[PDB]
Design a protein around this ligand. Structure first.
Ligand SMILES: OC[C@H]1O[C@H](O[C@H]2O[C@H](CO)[C@@H](O)[C@H](O)[C@H]2O)[C@H](O)[C@@H](O)[C@@H]1O
Ligand SMILES: OC[C@H]1O[C@H](O[C@H]2O[C@H](CO)[C@@H](O)[C@H](O)[C@H]2O)[C@H](O)[C@@H](O)[C@@H]1O
Ligand SMILES: OC[C@H]1O[C@@H](O)[C@H](O)[C@@H](O)[C@@H]1O
Ligand SMILES: OC[C@H]1O[C@H](O)[C@H](O)[C@@H](O)[C@@H]1O
Ligand SMILES: [Mg+2]
Length: 580
């Protein structure tokens, strides 16, 4: 009996009318005294319906250009479906009915079947567009990933950016391509049997191009703030519907299989039904198999069990892994010892912090909750993602950090890709890419200068505003064909094939997973009705024979995969083996 709050009849923004009758324009304003739409350069006064709702139907169709005029001020449409001249410009009318989808036989992807591959459209290819990205889909299918995780596409200011400065949430960022180019990308992925997920940012708007307050200051609250402005007021139903409307667009209109909600701890809502719960209700009302994941550092199972999200990006695994390999202790890395025993524990518990004191200076509190309710697929694990690379001063990747060997990097991949938790890989990870992933932006004027200054002060640090910082983050595809890059790629392929094919590795139950250690050797054991597998990872500096590792069970004898392709059951420093 949940009824969506959304009706195409009353949708805010510009919506094509049936019967070729044109377009219905709608907006909500709490403060404007005069309200007009400017279409293709001509102003038309809009009809006042009450409740600050304004509407007008005109015989213009898809492709018409418009913005609204509030008390005589031309103002971009926050509900714009496309912004061909960027976030300060006219919107284009978009008709979602005209694209010829060929993915009728695609029915989404279950979380337990996902191996995510995180893509930044601007850097994934030289062109930095959906059309160029689509040409890499067969490579990704053959690689063995099953779901692309696309960084945010909401329009933001400037000619490149990560996506976290999105301001017009309904408008795919024009430099990447037109709406139909995005549809072509999703349709192509589906035809290859790959899922496509989108990163969406419902905790804040970027600093440039967000005009919602021009319509109604009450979209936002002074009670709390975001990084860029006033906090998003989830007590206000129009603010709720701005994001639930947006979620439904991406899923229904662009055929995304799921969404990754950025920084859910900062979606503040004291309503009876939390906005996260209402998001789940709204997307499920679509009657598909769409998934919602949360990026959430609180180690809070209620995200799944109460808000009915599907899973959670859980960084304790990533952090424990990095500290294991580097010994670093700056910032939140101080929360972790690292090492075989620490990793065994963190895997056993899903996440490490289940209520214990987090002693990180400046952040001290009792962090997290018991993980018992969560099942293996509910945890999303990685050893690399945009933040864990990009929030480093030089944006270097794990194998590029001081004191990490390629052998260790390959061992880390084996651990990640054999665990029943849902893995995520960052673009280029699979071939040990030579290129960093640095923080880049392209804001205008004083704001641009403030970002450059901000980055310098926070930590030579590459200037985020420099074109070179963007270009230095571009993938170099040719390099994967040779040397250590090719070796790493072969291993990733072998791991992903084993994940797919191995009947024991099909396990998705924490009940069947056990872990432990002998000195600096980590072991991870899976036992199902199909058999037994053990992953051993030598995190020490010396060589260890599998036969001499003390285990509370008899080690399986058959060598299924060795991270350095060795014939015998011996582990060099940093190496791993899967036995069965
Ligand atoms: O404060 C938020 C929630 O805390 C508890 O929920 C967590 O802790 C429980 C055991 O302490 C677990 O059973 C549960 O899976 C966790 O999410 C509390 O039980 C909830 O009602 C609170 O909302
Ligand atoms: O070598 C001095 C440091 O020893 C420990 O850290 C190392 O050993 C950990 C396993 O116990 C690894 O995770 C870590 O990468 C190593 O640096 C100790 O924890 C540190 O506090 C010492 O500085
Ligand atoms: O993983 C825990 C960390 O997550 C970060 O994203 C939080 O903002 C930071 O405060 C915390 O130390
Ligand atoms: O601005 C007048 C009213 O406009 C809309 O109804 C908002 O949903 C409501 O919260 C507000 O009180
Ligand atoms: Mg020992």
């Amino acid at each position: 009996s949940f009824q969506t709050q959304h009706d195409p009849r009353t949708r805010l923004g510009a919506t094509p009318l049936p019967g070729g009758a044109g377009t219905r324009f709608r907006l909500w304003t709490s403060t404007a005294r005069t309200v007009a739409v400017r279409v293709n350069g001509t102003e038309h006064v809009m009809t006042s319906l009450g409740g600050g709702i304004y509407e007008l139907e005109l015989p213009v169709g898809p492709g018409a250009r418009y913005l609204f005029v509030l008390d005589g001020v031309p103002t971009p449409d926050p509900y714009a479906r496309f912004l061909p001249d960027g976030v300060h410009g006219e919107a284009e009318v978009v008709d979602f009915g005209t694209f010829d989808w060929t993915d009728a036989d695609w029915h989404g992807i279950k979380l337990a079947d996902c191996v995510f591959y995180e893509v930044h459209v601007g850097t994934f290819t030289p062109e930095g567009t959906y059309r160029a990205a689509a040409e890499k889909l067969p490579y990704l299918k053959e690689l063995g990933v099953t779901a692309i995780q696309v960084m945010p596409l909401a329009a933001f200011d400037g000619q490149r950016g990560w996506g976290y400065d999105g301001a017009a949430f309904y408008a795919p960022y024009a430099p990447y391509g037109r709406p139909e180019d995005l549809m072509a990308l999703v349709d192509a992925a589906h035809r290859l049997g790959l899922g496509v997920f989108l990163d969406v940012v419902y905790n804040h708007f970027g600093p440039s191009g967000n005009y919602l307050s021009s319509y109604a200051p009450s979209y936002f609250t002074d009670r709390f703030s975001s990084a860029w402005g006033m906090g998003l007021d989830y007590a206000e139903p129009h603010m709720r519907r701005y994001v639930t409307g947006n979620a439904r667009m991406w899923l229904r209109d662009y055929h995304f299989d799921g969404l990754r909600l950025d920084a859910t701890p900062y979606m503040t809502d004291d309503s009876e039904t939390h906005i996260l719960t209402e998001l789940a209700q709204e997307i499920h009302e679509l009657g598909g198999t769409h998934l919602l994941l949360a990026e959430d550092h609180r180690n809070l199972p209620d995200l799944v069990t109460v808000n009915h999200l599907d899973g959670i990006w859980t960084d304790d695994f990533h952090h424990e892994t990095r500290v294991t390999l580097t010994g670093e202790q700056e910032g939140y890395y101080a929360g972790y010892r690292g090492g075989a025993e620490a990793l065994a524990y963190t895997i056993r518990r899903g996440w490490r912090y289940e209520g214990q004191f987090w002693a990180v200076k400046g952040e001290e509190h009792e962090r997290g909750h018991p993980s018992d309710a969560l099942e293996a697929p509910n945890f999303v694990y990685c050893i690399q993602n945009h933040d864990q690379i990009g929030n480093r001063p030089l944006g270097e990747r794990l194998h590029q950090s001081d004191g990490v060997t390629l052998h260790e990097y390959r061992g880390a991949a084996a651990l990640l890709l054999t665990l029943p938790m849902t893995p995520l890989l960052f673009q280029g990870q699979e071939w040990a890419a030579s290129t960093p992933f640095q923080f880049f932006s392209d804001h205008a004027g004083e704001l641009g200068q403030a970002v450059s200054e901000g980055r310098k002060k926070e930590f030579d640090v590459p200037d985020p505003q420099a074109e070179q910082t963007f270009l230095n983050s571009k993938l170099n595809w040719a390099e994967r064909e040779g040397g250590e890059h090719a070796r790493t790629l072969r291993l990733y392929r072998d791991l992903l094939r084993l994940r797919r094919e191995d009947p024991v590795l099909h396990n998705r139950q924490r009940e069947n997973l056990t872990t432990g250690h002998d000195g600096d050797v980590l072991w991870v054991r899976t036992v199902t009705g199909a058999g037994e597998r053990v992953l051993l990872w030598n995190l020490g500096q010396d060589t260890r024979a599998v036969a001499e590792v003390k285990l509370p069970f008899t080690v399986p004898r058959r060598l299924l995969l060795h991270t350095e392709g060795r014939e015998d059951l011996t582990l060099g420093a940093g190496e791993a083996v899967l036995v069965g």
